[PDB]
Design a binder for these strands. Structure first.
Length: 61
RNA sequence: UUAAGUGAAUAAGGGCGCACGGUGGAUGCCUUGGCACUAGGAGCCGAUGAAGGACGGGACUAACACCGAUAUGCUUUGGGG
């Protein structure tokens, strides 16, 4: 879904990176204490972070 | 009845033949891996950090294969359904 990450600016990029890293922290705390019905969301967040970082590399030459 | 004479059978265990089992992995058939070559490519990598490794990445992950904090994967151009 890079078609939306290419509809933004390099400031909102770093903003959503902050948000997703925080989401990963909270997911990682759910999985340990006996919660988190939907365990497939940990991979999804990793991959959205990967996408933002590649797209930011591409545009700054 | 008494004398003189002749005397089988009976296996604690063993042998030979036969019948059925147990152990053990020979023989037959088979291939997932090898051996000797032919024709074609290629004949170097490295301070822009190598060859080879250590430690990590999975919902559960001891091991092997893959990958490197963007970690069981990210973008892009083509194929395929």
């Amino acid at each position: 879904k890079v078609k939306e990450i290419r509809e933004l600016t390099t400031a909102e990029m770093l903003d959503k990176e902050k948000q997703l890293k925080e989401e990963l922290f909270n997911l990682r705390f759910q999985l340990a204490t006996g919660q988190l019905e939907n365990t497939a969301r940990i991979k999804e967040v990793r991959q959205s972070i990967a996408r933002i970082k590649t797209v930011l590399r591409e545009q700054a030459n």
